Design a protein around this nucleic acid. Structure first.
Lengths: 101, 272, 73, 88, 119
RNA sequence: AUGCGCAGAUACCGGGAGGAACGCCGAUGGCGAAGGCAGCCACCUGGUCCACCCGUGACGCUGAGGCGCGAAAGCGUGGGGAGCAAACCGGAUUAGAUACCCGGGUAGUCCACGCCCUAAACGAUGCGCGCUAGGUCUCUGGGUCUCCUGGGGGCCGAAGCUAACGCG
């Protein structure tokens, strides 16, 4: 297992118990695959600079974690699954590079 | 339990270009099934060319699901019948009883799927149109609810979900057209099971065709004593007519047929 | 090279390893959300490259117009 | 993929002496292993002629080195043959 | 008449005919004019001249309805798009703000010989 | 001209579908036996540059033959065609116009697996090593990084090479 950052945006017009059921789906799925968080984050709801999802805003979730490398593709698909997943994006876990120092 | 299409005998004299296909379930069907009379002759007058037979099984199949609208079923497995353009899956209903049903896109023995009031849009289950995730595929589909699976897209991988309006959803049917069915009606989820079949190649005609069951057709067959068209000579006639006091082959048939405007448009054609 | 604006000195120590940098990233947008060039970021091959990459990542998931109706013209 | 660890471990099983941080032995172990899982991949793929190609060159290399292996001494060499499996 | 003081003025132009039209605040329109609208044919209709004229019309009509304030929509380029747009500000009838589109491709469909000679 | 529109088009607004392509950034720039290869993401992968000097111990350079590899065109079956588009059909042409222009529209162009290997296949210049001023720029790896050093690209460029360019 390696680690990538899970950046994924999910519908705006959501709500309570919904946030509940699909985000948790997020969960157990993840695990079922081989996911298990390292950074449970997200910055809540936010707008964008281009009306995607037929909307000007949505909810964005970010959790970076450990997983079984290749499974990535797999769960990914499992994710986009759930309609609302306005954007399903995973990236290899790097972060260094100070430009202008 | 899928099936090979391509196997072709080879140079066993003119038995050339013979295409085999072999579903792997190979089991001999089960308990629910009678047989058909020897029609070709019928209502006891006799009619329509070709026609001959060749061995005898004969089907009973499920055409209606709302009759358990739920009891998951698991592919009993694959198999088929001396009829239908694209094999079947004898399915097992979790309640004990089973049913011969379609055989959508290569599903999988033991697979669970079902249908009714909300089925997961996974090719295999079936649902009232309405649960139509517009842009998806089905077949079997039936307009006029209850009127059983009406539009059994034979091996007809063809029910293309195309938008909705009123109490009717739009569909692209084999043919190359788009009709409408009130949502509550229904569709077998996904697509067919056979096509390559459609491409199948068979050797010495007599042999094959007949085996098929069908014998012949032979137009303007010289002695036009009848054979609508000309004869008693080489030359292909002129008038422009067909067997049993015909209109050639470029004229209508429909009419007011309240049927028609009532739904569907695209009018009758394609362009491969 | 032409000089009256420039940006390599708009923000200091900036980690190119990102995407969620609404602000900084913006700092190369110009009008039709183009990609304000060597011509402005004055950032080595290494730079235009990786920096770019993320620019990408950015339009990618979104939250930045990777072009946009220009208001002014 | 390329599992450095186990890697070194076998560079070890082979390098008769624990001080073979680069020897015919290893050229062997390595080119072999690589060659193999690599190739297997090749299979479930069918089209990457570029890398197939390289792999090619590589396999060549390795075999040839062995060539010399024999040249001076194929004895210990055939042992190697043995240990490994290749060329049979 | 519908009347709504402000809307959009669409100026789109070819290079042997150009066009302009009055549209409400949202997107429909009411009236317009162009190269051949201007009792014109063949070339000519592609003159910053006509540009000026049809601009004109777009205007008189423009007032002719409960409007005159407008944002300018830019579509393509016209052989005299200027004499055109200037005729525009000119009749004033309000000479508001201006939007930039002329909605670029992005590379996805080789043209006809014409701009194929543009390898 | 034309062909398309008051059975309302051409423009503007909203929504639908799909194929292809992939802008700025992106370069006179990069990776590859070659061909040629780009919106990002992830899966697996290969060439390959620098530094400790640690390992082996010259095993290496060459490659007739073969063996795999690859433009675009075109064929084979099975998908698919938004646009472009030989062919074809028009319209414009001259004296002629089968073509240069405008109006159309197939095959093909695209995907999968198979098949052709094809060439101004180019730097028209086989590969492998080592010896002979410098100057400049640009990308990239290491450092006491006014620069130096290994590598990599264009440019100027003594000697010198050639019938002459021009190589350098």
């Amino acid at each position: 297992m390696r680690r990538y950052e899970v950046n994924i945006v999910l519908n705006p017009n959501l709500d309570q118990s919904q946030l509940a059921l699909e985000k948790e789906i997020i969960q157990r799925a993840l695990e079922n695959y081989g996911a298990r968080v390292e950074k449970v984050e997200e910055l809540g709801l936010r707008r964008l600079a281009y009306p995607i999802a037929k909307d000007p805003q949505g909810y964005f979730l970010w959790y970076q974690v450990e997983m079984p490398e290749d499974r990535v593709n797999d769960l990914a698909r499992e994710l986009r699954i759930r309609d609302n997943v306005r954007r399903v994006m995973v990236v290899k876990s790097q972060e260094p590079f100070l430009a202008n120092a | 339990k899928f099936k090979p299409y391509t196997p072709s005998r080879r140079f066993m004299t003119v038995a050339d270009f013979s295409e085999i296909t072999k579903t792997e379930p190979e089991k001999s069907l089960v308990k629910p099934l009678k047989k058909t009379g020897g029609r070709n002759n019928q209502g006891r007058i006799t009619v329509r060319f070709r026609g001959g037979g060749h061995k005898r099984l004969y089907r009973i199949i499920d055409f209606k699901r709302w009759d358990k609208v739920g009891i998951p079923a698991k592919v009993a497995a694959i198999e088929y019948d001396p009829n239908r353009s694209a094999r079947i899956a004898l399915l097992h209903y979790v309640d004990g009883e089973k049913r011969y049903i379609i055989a959508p896109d290569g599903l999988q023995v033991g697979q669970q799927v079902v249908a009714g009031p909300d089925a997961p849009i996974q090719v295999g289950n079936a649902l009232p149109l309405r649960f139509i995730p517009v842009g998806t595929v089905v077949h079997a589909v039936e307009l006029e609810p209850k009127k059983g699976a009406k539009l059994a897209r034979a091996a007809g991988t063809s029910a293309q979900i195309q938008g909705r309006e009123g109490d009717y959803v739009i569909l692209r049917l084999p043919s190359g057209e788009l009709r409408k069915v009130h949502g509550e009606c229904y569709a077998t989820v996904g697509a067919v099971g056979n096509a390559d079949h459609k491409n199948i190649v068979l050797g010495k005609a007599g042999r094959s065709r007949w085996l098929g069951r069908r014998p012949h057709v032979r137009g303007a067959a010289m002695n036009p004593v009848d054979h609508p068209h000309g004869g008693g000579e080489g030359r292909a006639p002129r008038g422009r007519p067909p067997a049993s006091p015909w209109g050639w082959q470029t004229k209508g048939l429909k009419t007011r047929k309240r049927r028609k405007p009532s739904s569907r448009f695209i009018i009758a054609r394609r362009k491969k | 090279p032409s000089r009256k604006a420039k940006v390599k000195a708009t923000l200091g120590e900036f980690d190119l390893r990102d995407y969620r940098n609404v602000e900084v990233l913006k700092r190369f947008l110009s009008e039709t959300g183009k990609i304000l060039p060597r011509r402005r970021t004055g950032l080595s091959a290494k730079e235009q490259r990786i920096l770019a990459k993320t620019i990408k990542r950015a339009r990618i998931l979104g939250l930045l117009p990777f072009t946009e109706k220009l208001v002014r013209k | 993929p390329i599992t450095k660890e186990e890697k070194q471990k076998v560079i070890q099983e082979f390098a008769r002496f624990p001080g073979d941080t680069g020897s015919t032995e290893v050229q062997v172990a390595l080119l072999t292993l690589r060659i193999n899982r690599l190739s297997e991949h090749l299979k479930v793929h069918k089209k990457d002629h570029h890398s197939h190609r390289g792999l090619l060159m590589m396999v060549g290399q390795r075999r040839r080195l062995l060539r010399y292996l024999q040249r001076e001494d194929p004895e210990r060499y055939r042992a190697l043959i043995e240990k490994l499996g290749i060329r049979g | 008449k519908r009347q709504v003081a402000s809307g959009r003025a669409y100026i789109h132009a070819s290079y042997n005919n150009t066009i302009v039209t009055i549209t409400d605040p949202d997107g429909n329109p009411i009236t317009w004019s162009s190269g051949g609208v201007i009792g014109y044919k063949g070339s000519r209709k592609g003159t910053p001249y006509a540009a000026q004229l049809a601009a004109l019309d777009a205007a008189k009509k423009a007032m002719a309805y409960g409007m005159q304030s407008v944002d300018v929509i830019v579509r393509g380029t016209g052989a005299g798009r200027e004499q055109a747009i200037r005729a525009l500000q000119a009749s004033g009838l309000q000479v508001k703000s201006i939007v930039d589109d002329t909605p670029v491709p992005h590379n996805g469909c080789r043209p006809k010989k014409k701009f194929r000679k543009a390898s």
